[PDB]
């Protein structure tokens, strides 16, 4: 099986093609069409049968049709497919290689004979007709047994015998080189470097040379077994090695006729030999199994097609899949493709799972819309920005900004004891005597039934429950207005005022509700009547089977009257579990729950559970149990900034807002970046004033022109401390820098705009690389009209 | 998926993001350079430049930290890393808008990877050819960005490969600031942790086990604030490995690697994995012609979302 390429002959964009049979007895052209990929588009044109054994088979590219076919008996044929003559040597004997020279001269290969030569070179028009001997214009090579010859220029053949390789140029008897070597077989030029060829030997061994290296002589490759071995033995040997005609410095190999390895070389200049190197080797499986011979079908847009050849005998078209050789992830969550075989790059921007989808619902992209919608800044902000478009999110920014609310109202700073963004479970858990700090909070509270009263007064105002019946109703008006009639309902249940609920769920629009209130309307009176009566029962059933959890938790409160079921399940607000266990409960049994859901929600990680552990330790230990679970760094941060450097210091906290600092640069925020700066300088005062925050340390220092020593070590004019002189004149109008209410208005290139401007245009500015100060509006006004420093003597372009 | 022609005239080799994820920098082996500006009107891949940079193959460029300038290096088969500052006082498409710095002729072998550290420990440089040697070049001059100076030079690879064998060798620096420095370090079927000692040296630290074949693509997740780091590797074989990293002679914190997941969804060879920037969404490239995302579940197994066939 002998499949070999063949160009110079079509003109459309099919590619020719020539087959010869497994048994070796025909040879077939065909006719490939590259941007097809269907087994179809090899069509079989003609087929010349008359062949005892063909061992060589070569072409024409200036003639079309012109095809030579050797033989092991020693009858080389040359014909047309698209006349027909039969040559031999004078002494007969087999038909190794052939080449065919673009202005018609013809080599031949033959056996080992002491009496003739082994590379006869002739032409076919000086040849006589009446005699099938050939008379060779150059006779080589005489006592040799050429096996593979290719021919390099017009003039020059490379020519490979069983003991040498050897360069034979037609206008001088005596050889260009003469390098001893055994791997000495099918040669195949590089058609994008003809200083390089490859051949193998008879164990395997492939080596790829340069014929420079042997001209002056190792060759530049060597790879040990990679092709059939019994190179001497057998004159019939399938081709599975093949140069690349798509890429340079690229070769196919074929492995066991099942898989086709595509080594990729590098190169490097020892400073214009290139010595090689093996880069890459990518393995593609055949379609079909038992593949002999194969060669390559370029296409457009740099692919690659196989057309290979079975041991059957069937030839058909095999594509190279699309192998992506990166995918990178940027920060806005847009996937880069980088292919193996053609040029262009591929991009699934954020504009199983689809991408996209998957892309647009990730939480980096999530905290990059929050952060550039300005999450975190103000919780009530942030509690209308997550209305206006996760519920517990919402509900654990509402304990922030009631207890930010709380602190900046002062309601909560006062006394020997901060207590502030304190925590339920460390208020009801006590812990410097019991008597101080119950007199400190009842000091607080002047702003039972139980033994620890004003503890539960320090829990109801830590989570905002601290309620009237005037304040209950105005916040039944509000959630009515707001359009939660559920939430309403559930809120009134939560009270305890059952007839409040029913008048407040049965005054809506949907008809829906109205059968609802209908049902909750019945314990109005079915309430000293404990049995098993179906009421109970289909409430239980529709407390299970309905889809809102105030509705089920409004049912579950009706039917089989208890506490437990209300506060237990995690679809309402813990905010409202707490209101309903801090006002309805015992305190042998408060202190139950708290335990079980404070030591739910640290290992959890829910943000929820801020009500019962503060801004603490514990708080830090649940943030970053929250972090583990979901990488929202961003709410972790802006929850820490509210009391973490405050009031202690761990390196997580720093680490997080670190981290959001590094991610608000990433996606270009830096106002956003600037606002969370300042935010977390107000949140560090202290109780008596000193802030703690790690600011930036100062980046002037200027030094004074007067005593020579540091100004820093006046909110209208500014000094040297140590001798009182003022800072260096401007360059444009030589009036002292740092003072404002200048005599005039630097006027520099909605009025309240424009008089910031003009009150910003007269600040310290000055060049880095020739340290000559201006004013701000003093550099606008002049760097619009010049480009040197206006300082005399100075060469800076201080513009850029 | 919108297809964009880099423009190339042969195979695109490396493709990197900038920090601010707007400009894009592709190196190939037409000895070529060139970088892509993401316009903010038309939303489509613009070119910026296009350089001739080397006398070989370019295999791998990085951008440096934004707090550092622009600078661009680029390692190529030619045992060269060169570094490229951008000028903004030329014209676009022309060739010289970015600037030649330095030619770091100290590496005896065809360099494969070119990494930078992180911010916080200055403008570092990290190189590996198949000489199997690791270098660091730092920059101590701060008035001339042409001074760079070798540091640390260690050894991964006892003797280097034949021309013959294929190699493949890959780098990834540590993104904390709060950890002390680290560098993952891929040889051939090797993986290895080199960690900063208190003698301002390299050592050996930890060694993710497995990998029975060559590694192609090694990948340190960004710490986003959890007590455990994450390295995601695409070996020659199916698996793309996901180390757990817990840290806590002569090093300041010895630390524990334990295997969280193996993967053989592609069924060929990992060529490249990645992470985004948050560690939750991997990316993983491989011989099936399908690009496979992964994201973590609820009981910290990673369990694949997305498949986008090319
Ligand atoms: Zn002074
Ligand atoms: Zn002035
Ligand atoms: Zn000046
Ligand atoms: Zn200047």
Redesign the interface.
Known sequence: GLIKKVTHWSYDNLIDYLSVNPTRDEVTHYKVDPENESDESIIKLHTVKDFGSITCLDYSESEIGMIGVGEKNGYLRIFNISYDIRVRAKKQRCINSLGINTNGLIAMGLDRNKHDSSLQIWDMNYHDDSHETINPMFSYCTNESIVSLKFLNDTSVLAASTKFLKEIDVRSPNPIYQHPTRLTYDIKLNPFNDWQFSTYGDDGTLAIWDRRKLSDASPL????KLVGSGAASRKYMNSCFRWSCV???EFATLHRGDTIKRW?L????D?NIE?????????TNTMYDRVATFDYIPRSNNGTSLICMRQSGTIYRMPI?????????????????????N???????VN????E???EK???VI?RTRASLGYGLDPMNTVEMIDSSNAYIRNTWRWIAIAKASVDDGTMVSGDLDLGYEGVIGIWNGILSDKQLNKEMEKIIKLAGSPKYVQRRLCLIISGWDLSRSDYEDKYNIIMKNGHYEKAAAWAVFFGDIPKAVEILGSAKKERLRLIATAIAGYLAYKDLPGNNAWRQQCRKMSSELDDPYLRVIFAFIADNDWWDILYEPAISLRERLGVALRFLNDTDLTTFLDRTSSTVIENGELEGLILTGITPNGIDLL?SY???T?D?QS?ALISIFGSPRYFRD??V???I??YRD?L????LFSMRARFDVLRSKLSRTKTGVLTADIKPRQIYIQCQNCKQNINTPRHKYCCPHCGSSFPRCAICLMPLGTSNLPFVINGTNRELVSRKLKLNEWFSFCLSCNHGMHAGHAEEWFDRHNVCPTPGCTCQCN? | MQPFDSGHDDLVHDVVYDFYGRHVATCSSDQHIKVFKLDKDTSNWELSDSWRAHDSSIVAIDWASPEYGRIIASASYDKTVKLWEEDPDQEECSGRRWNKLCTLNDSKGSLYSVKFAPAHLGLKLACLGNDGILRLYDALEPSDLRSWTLTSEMKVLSIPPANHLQSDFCLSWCPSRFSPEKLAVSALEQAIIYQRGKDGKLHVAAKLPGHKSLIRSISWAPSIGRWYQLIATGCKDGRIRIFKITEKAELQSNLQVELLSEHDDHNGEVWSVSWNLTGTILSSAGDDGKVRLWKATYSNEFKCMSVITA
Not at chain 1, 266 to 269: E, I, L, N, Q, V
Not at chain 1, 321 to 341: D, G, P, Y
């Open positions: 490759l060597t790879f040990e890429r340079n410095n990729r590098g190169y490097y200049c400073s010595n090689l190197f093996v880069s890459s080797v990518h393995d899949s699309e192998v992506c050789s990166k995918a990178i992830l940027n920060n806005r969550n847009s996937l880069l493709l980088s292919n193996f075989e040029t262009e790059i591929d991009e699934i921007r199983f799972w689809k991408p989808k998957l892309l990730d939480i980096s905290m970053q972090v583990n679970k990488s760094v972790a390196q997580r720093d680490e997080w670190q981290t991610m640069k990433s996606w270009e850029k």
